[PDB]
Amino acid sequence: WVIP
Amino acid sequence: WVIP
Amino acid sequence: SCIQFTRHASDVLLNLNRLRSRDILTDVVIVVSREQFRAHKTVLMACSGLFYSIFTDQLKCNLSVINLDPEINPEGFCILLDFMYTSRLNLREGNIMAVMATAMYLQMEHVVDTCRKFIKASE
Amino acid sequence: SCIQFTRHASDVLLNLNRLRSRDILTDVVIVVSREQFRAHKTVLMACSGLFYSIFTDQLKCNLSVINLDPEINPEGFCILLDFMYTSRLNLREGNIMAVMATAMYLQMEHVVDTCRKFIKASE
Ligand SMILES: N#Cc1cnn2c(Nc3ccc4c(c3)CC(=O)N4)cc(Cl)nc12
Ligand SMILES: N#Cc1cnn2c(Nc3ccc4c(c3)CC(=O)N4)cc(Cl)nc12
Ligand SMILES: [Cl-]
Ligand SMILES: [Cl-]
């Protein structure tokens, strides 16, 4: 999971 | 396009 | 010896979400209490262990309407349906419990994982 | 303020290809001369300007069989259909002309681009  |  | 187009999977998913927004080729309505959500069975199966089981069933595969358990929160479902079609999860303090419960019911393991990690960090 | 699961779009596409291999929820047969290819209209539209136009047409949207132009090469179509479902393009000296012609007909601009670049490098 990432900060887009 | 890339070499996978 | 294939070559691969990096953005292809994302571009496909973007067009599947466009089809959903325009209600094109949607083949099922998911009923969550008083709310209805139109979707493509193929996308639902591709994202959810629950829908994969439902739509591989020789009788349920032909249903145009699927009713979820009355304990399922419509907003939580809405957030997960948006995630299915975009890879983006609108996870907030006010909805995390509902999202995690819905993801457990829908058998969306990666979403459950992250909900567990975000909850563990706040305690 | 969304979070994003990097591998989600690829995982969706992998499951759509699994559905295609098992012939689950396929709703169209594409006929290319003597050959037939089963697929999902939603994936075809998401990948191809030609299929996007065909399946948004108020009459063609309901057809279970689509016949392509007799000049279309079945192997070229097969290679492009595999690309649609996997992001992988089996581009070879022996098939590049057929793949590029098929990609132009199907309106798959990124494939046309790369075929043009691979041809330019060999001349
Ligand atoms: N054919 C087919 C096909 C269509 N969909 N699909 C799967 N869908 C699925 C099943 C379980 C889970 C998820 C997705 C996300 C998750 O957390 N669990 C799996 C397989 Cl093995 N195959 C298929
Ligand atoms: N709704 C919808 C929807 C479903 N599919 N789709 C598009 N599919 C498409 C149209 C043109 C081209 C390609 C894909 C690859 C290419 O080279 N050209 C576009 C839009 Cl703007 N919208 C949609
Ligand atoms: Cl997931
Ligand atoms: Cl393309």
Experimental method: X-ray
Pair type for strands C3-4 and D88-89: antiparallel
Backbone angles phi, psi at D58, to 5 degrees: -55, -20
Q: Evaluate whether D76 touches D95 at the Cβ level (below 8 Å).
A: yes
- Are D114 and B4 a contacting pair at CB < 8 A? no
Considering only the C-alpha atoms of chain D, give the largest distance between any 2 of them, rounded to a whole number of Å: 51
Residue C49 CA: which ligand 1 atom is closest?
11
d(CA C109, CA C94): 21
List the subunits that have 3+ CB pairs under 8 angstroms with C. A, B, D
- Please answer whether residues C19 and D42 qualify as being in contact, where contact means their C-beta atoms are separated by less than 8 angstroms: yes
- Nearest ligand to the CA atom of C48: 1
Q: Say whether A1 and C88 touch across the interface (CB within 8 A).
A: no
Intra-chain end-to-end CA distance of chain C, in Å: 50
How far apart CA D47 and CA C4 sit, in angstroms, is 14
What is the H or E stretch that residue D109 is in? helix D109-122
Nearest CA in chain D to C25: D42
Q: What are phi and psi of C76, to 5 degrees?
A: -55, -45
Find, among C115, C118, C117, the residue nearest to C103 by Cα.
C115
Alpha carbon nearest to ligand 1 atom 12, residue: C49
> Which secondary structure element, helix H or strand E, spans residue C115, and what is its range?
helix C109-122
| Residue C58, C-beta contacts closer than 8 angstroms, at least 6 positions apart | none
Residue pairs spanning B and C at CB distance below 8 A: 12
Alpha carbons C105 and C54: distance in angstroms, whole number: 13
From D23, D57, D82, select the one nearest D92 (Cα to Cα). Answer: D82
- A1 vs C114: CB contact, 8 Å cut-off? yes
- Contact (Cβ atoms closer than 8 angstroms) between residue D72 and residue D33: yes
Tokens of C115: 């909900």
| CA gap C76, C104 in Å, rounded | 11
Chains that touch D (3 or more CB pairs under 8 A): A, B, C
Any ligand 2 atom below 6 A from CB of D25:
no
How far apart, in whole angstroms, are the C-alpha atoms of residue C56 and residue C32? 21
In sequence order, the β-bridge partners of residue C67 are C31
d(CA C59, CA C46): 19
CB contact under 8 A, A4 and C114: no
Q: In chain D, where do the E strands start and end?
A: 3-4, 28-32, 35-39, 65-67, 88-89
Nearest to D75 by CA among D41, D54, D100: D100
Contact of D34 with chain B, judged by CB distance below 8 Å, is answered with: no
Angle between helices D8-21 and C8-21 (to 10 degrees): 80
Q: Is the shortest distance between the CB of D44 and ligand 2 below 6 Å?
A: no
Q: C62: helix, coil or strand?
A: helix
Confirm or reject contact between C88 and chain A (CB < 8 A). Answer: yes
CB atoms within 10 A of CB C6: 11
Under a CB-based contact definition with an 8 Å cutoff, are residues C27 and C45 in contact? no
Substitution target from C4, C7, C8, C11 for chain B, most B beta carbons within 10 A: C4
Distances (CA, A) of D34 to C60, C100, D27, D73, D75: 34, 50, 19, 10, 11
Phi, psi angles (nearest 5°) of residue D36: -125, 140
- Kindly report the CATH number assigned to the domain that includes residue D6: 3.30.710.10
| Number of domains within chain C | 1
Q: How far apart are CA C33 and CA C76, in angstroms?
A: 12
Q: Return the ligand 2 atom nearest residue C19 CA.
A: 1
For residues D44 and D55, is the Cβ–Cβ distance under 8 A?
Answer: yes
Residues 6+ apart with CB under 8 A from D101: D71, D72, D73, D76
Domain of residue D98, residue span: 1-123
Please give the number of the atom of ligand 2 that sits closest to the Cα of C18. Answer: 1
How many whole angstroms separate alpha carbon D93 and alpha carbon B1?
17
Neighbours of B2 (CB within 10 A): 8
Does B4 contact C4 at a Cβ distance shorter than 8 Å? yes
- String of b and e for D50-74 (b: at least 16 CB within 10 Å)? bbbebbeeeeeeeeeebebeeebbb
